[PDB]
Design a protein around this ligand. Structure first.
Ligand SMILES: *Cc1c(C*)[n+]([O-])c2ccccc2[n+]1[O-]
Ligand SMILES: *Cc1c(C*)[n+]([O-])c2ccccc2[n+]1[O-]
Lengths: 170, 172, 171, 171, 172, 170, 171, 172, 171, 172
């Protein structure tokens, strides 16, 4: 069962990830005081390109500018992640990744966020926005064929940051 | 109790009264087979907060109709409450003319089924769902109360789903 | 499901309401030592003019004269109430309301008093009388098409007030 | 425990009663096509004179005029009723009763309508209105010290009778 | 639901209102410790059937008092109903003066506890119980409605119990 | 649990008994159309005499005159019964018995009539009156030290027989 | 309902009245600590069939006493029934003088605990049990109704148990 | 798991491999319908204690055969263990030649059914059971491990049952 | 949650996608009736540790084919991950050409059914199973993560099973 | 009853009688704390099949001792059966002298715990288990009855674990 609810504390997670070509540990508490964008993707080494996943890495300086962490996640391993990172974008790989890419091989994080496709053991294209106090603020879940807009995600986070300080105004 | 909304599975069935074209009409999910459906929730009628978010879907509905997509607005307010707010001009902070149906979920049933109900208040969160011609739920968007939704993004999603329905996904 | 019983403590409630044009908090404990009359109505902005609801507001000086609080309630929002209050009575609105109008978007108060029409999420035309000690004394529930009488409500409260002090009757 | 709900079929009952000085059987189905007013009272032979019960008997021609049946009921025996009927009104009795007085020694009818004071085995001062189609339309329950008004009962039935044929109101 | 009356065990405890000497009094089983108690039930007040059975226990109560035995009458009629029937003279088919308390079990609780309740009518069967000084139930007699009970037999039993309490049983 | 209730069909029983010095089978259905008086007693060969039990045997011609069967019962065996019958009344025995004496060694009949003293496995001094249609009409249960009156039993049966034909009259 | 007798386990505890030397006495299992006990059941008192097999245990009790062994007879007959059968001469099919205590189990409790109760008749099967000084069940013997038990065998068993208590296995 | 062995009830059914006349054979209780059957249990093969108790039943089998009685021995050892012990001469603490079948209960099933299984060791107590022609259990004998059984006693019992089958109604 | 693999029982049935000869193919257990199957699990794709032990089964598959035996490799990695690692040269720590099918169990289903799933990591232990032609599980081998399996041993086992299928026991 | 044997978890605890150096001894798993332990199961004593598979582990025990490894054999036969088979010369299909302990599991407890018990026969499958110094299970091998185990394989596995304990982080 899903543990993700709007207004309630975001489901806690701890796993290995790949960041700057190295294995590192990533917890939700590590990003206390910051806004967090956690987004899921189905599979490593898919024939259709990860242009959407790349787009979040390329435009990370914009997220860093707003003091916002971006975390990528799938049910593939950290070893699978690093390999796809080591694959050039010319050969349908990820190339250099400026965001951490999380491994959810135990399916725990997908399950907790309720984005697991049970009959396949892979994650739907979900995207979650978590505030500085660790409260879940936004849920977005897409069916497999359709990716997510970076512009929209930026619009949402800035809207949330603005409404945090200002409440409801123009 | 439990949300019935799942990606890949049939979208939760709903049947309620609504306001369309200044009349009370019956609205069922079956009424929209062979068509894409965008169902979106809002919290309250007669809010001091700008309804420009809800109005935007009505104003830009010709864009949705052009793509053969039905748009449905919904809240836990009454069908009478809907009509009164529609009858209020936009100058006084009303909805004015609505080109889309506004569903009444005083039942709380649809909000519950789509899992968008704020239990302690009996109002719906700013959720928006995309349902395909086959009655299969394709997209879930739930926002916390202060942040509204973008029409452009909703259009970007629905067009992407329609394209991927006939074609396969393609990289270059 | 219902928590309302005669001779037992009346179901506790706390919600937002509209009184004198402002949003205020209403708790049951706020009316300790007074008799309370809590009455429900189905919907805001009905085509049927709300003459029964208006009558309890207009004749409230009589209730105040007896040190009796009168509270109106429905499953509509506080925003919905205020809009209907701001609507003139000639245009089928409530007009000036001299009693507080409670918002039960929770369904909690209706459920607790057992006046909720489940299939519609609206309250039946119920009326309840609660004594100074917070004990429920009277239960009245009407089907939707029929409203309530202020004269009866006053007769009931005055009968309860008299029997609290005296108890028994010559006729 | 209770079976009584607004808009649902009224709880079915069949018991012995006293009408016109004889023991007769009373079933709910016997009053199909008529509006029924069923009201409960606590006890036979109270020191309090039964003026409220007597008033419904005396003013019954008005109820008959509207094709409306009126039934009184308590948890006392049919023998107890008849004795109280045979007691003159000047000696704190019922006198001539022009309506049937039902014996609920079963507690069954009281339980079904949810007016039973469990700890005492007596019924609260409840009144119920049932339509020609056997659907419950109105619920009224009073704490013991306070009786009911015939004028209100007539106002209610006439309001229900009018709205059955017409439905909506100008005022 | 269940009868609580058992031979050798403590008799079911009861506490109710009653009519004694033209007044409403409170009656408890504890009020009779160190004394033998005869508790008997009857069906209805104001019966067309001769109450001579109930009256007989009142009339011959001096015989019971002489043996230091308390007699209690009971039915599921009200304490007000009891008084009205007591106030009715024996010439009109009343009880007249009652030298014993008449308990009101409108509660149905005592009838239930002694298992004498005719469920479908909410009346008590013609049951009669004998309880010793220690609050131990000693004798159960339950009769079907048409047949009354004998005072002489009740006296024969209570005297036998008192004799066997101090002495042992003896043959010759 | 007890199965005996006033107005309801009397608990059915079938067991061996001793009648005229022989073992015979006795059923409740055998006495259909007749009134039946079933009475229990605790024990065979008690030092206190069975004068009460004897009294029902001696005065049986009175019961036979009213077409009424009298049945005695205890949790002793048929062999124990016959032996006590074979013991002369001079030596605290039963002597000749004109009523059948039932054996309830399985405790089934006592249990069904709810007269069993569990901690001892013996029956209390119970007496039950059953009508021609097999309906239980009267319950009498005495504590061990106190016996039962034949006069009272006769009064009851005749009252029941009268009220059967007449209803309620003088 | 459930048997408690298990080999190698503490023998089911019992306490009841019995007849010994023509007197009512209380018998407990704890009374026989530091000693071997032979408890044997029989069906009925005043059985037409020869009780000689039961009698044989009483007559040859000097042999059991010589080995420091207690013998106990038991049935679901009363303690009064036992004494009466004891007072009946052996010539007239009685027990006569009994050197061993005869236990009354009108309770059905001891039979149940040893699992020798014939439910449909409320009588005990011809069971025989051997309990050691520490109170541990060592031997179970249960015969169907028509067949009795051998005193020689009982003796053979008990002294074999006594021998193996101190020696073990002489091969 | 609890015992299935009751007197007067059909004896627990069994089917296992056994060693008869130096060969492996299949043994069923149904095989002895119409005959009296004596089934006895023993703890272990290759014990330092003389199997003289077991031997005695084998040697004196012509007495049982004369009375049309089958005799079955059993333990929780294998058939391979049985044959090994049978092939061991009696001079070297073996069984020697066996006139009776020796049943193997390696799965502990038959011991469990007859309630002779010592759980903590997985071995059978020295039990002996007598079953009639109709397959009804007639006699239960369970001994603790250190004490053996008497053939004369077994024979006395068997004949007593055969006599009472023919007549009953005994006066010994 | 529960393992289904039992010796002497029908081997747990499986159906999944796999990589064979550089193509995505469907693999079922029913596909291998009338033949011996060796199913073996491995933890992870693109592991830094030498996959040579896994590779050895592919290289020496001619020996397995010679005995009419099917070899199946499996892990909780995707079918896309398998192919990518296959396309990675053995010089760069890849699989290279694989003569045997490599099954994808992102389901976790097959690992669970064979009871080789390491729950906390969602990866399979180094398990190896031998299934006969009738589809009955004959051998279970499970190794902890750091230790691999011997092809010689797998061969020794399978041909021993094939020999005993037709001969029994040559003593 | 189900299996308690899991990889990475503490190995199931056992305590039974065994035959070592021609004597009965008590064996516990706790006795080998700080050592690697190989526990293997076999079906039956006195089988017509050569116990050469069992013999091979006994003969080559000095290789296991060199690697500080204990080797334990087990079956559901008795210690009396074990000693009998050990005392049987290898020329006559016996075990002969045994350098390893042979555990008796007559109560079926250890087989059950390791999930190697064939229920319908009450015998153990040819299982082999490797336990580390901390008492953690490291390797499971279960064979069907007709197929034996390799000493070389057992030795290969043991050393691989000892090496990876010291270093880990392998690149074979
Ligand atoms: C997006 C994409 C992908 C996935 N792949 O594989 C290729 C390959 C070769 C050229 C272009 C290209 N694009 O663009
Ligand atoms: C009543 C009775 C009893 C029981 N017993 O035993 C005897 C014995 C001897 C003389 C008289 C007598 N009575 O009367």
């Amino acid at each position: 069962m899903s543990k993700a609810f709007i207004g309630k504390p975001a489901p806690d997670f701890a796993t290995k990830a790949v960041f700057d070509g190295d294995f590192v540990d990533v917890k939700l508490s590590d990003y206390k005081g910051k806004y967090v964008v956690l987004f899921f993707y189905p599979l490593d080494f898919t024939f259709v390109c990860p242009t959407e996943i790349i787009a979040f890495s390329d435009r990370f300086p914009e997220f860093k500018n707003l003091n916002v962490a971006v975390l990528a996640c799938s049910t593939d391993s950290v070893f699978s992640h690093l390999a796809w990172i080591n694959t050039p974008r010319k050969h349908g790989g990820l190339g250099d990744m400026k965001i951490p890419v999380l491994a959810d091989t135990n399916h725990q994080i997908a399950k907790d966020y309720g984005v697991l496709k049970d009959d396949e053991g892979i994650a739907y294209r979900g995207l979650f926005i978590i505030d500085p106090k660790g409260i879940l603020r936004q849920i977005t879940i897409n069916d497999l064929p359709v990716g997510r807009s970076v512009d929209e995600t930026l619009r949402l986070v800035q809207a949330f940051q603005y409404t945090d300080k200002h409440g409801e105004v123009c």
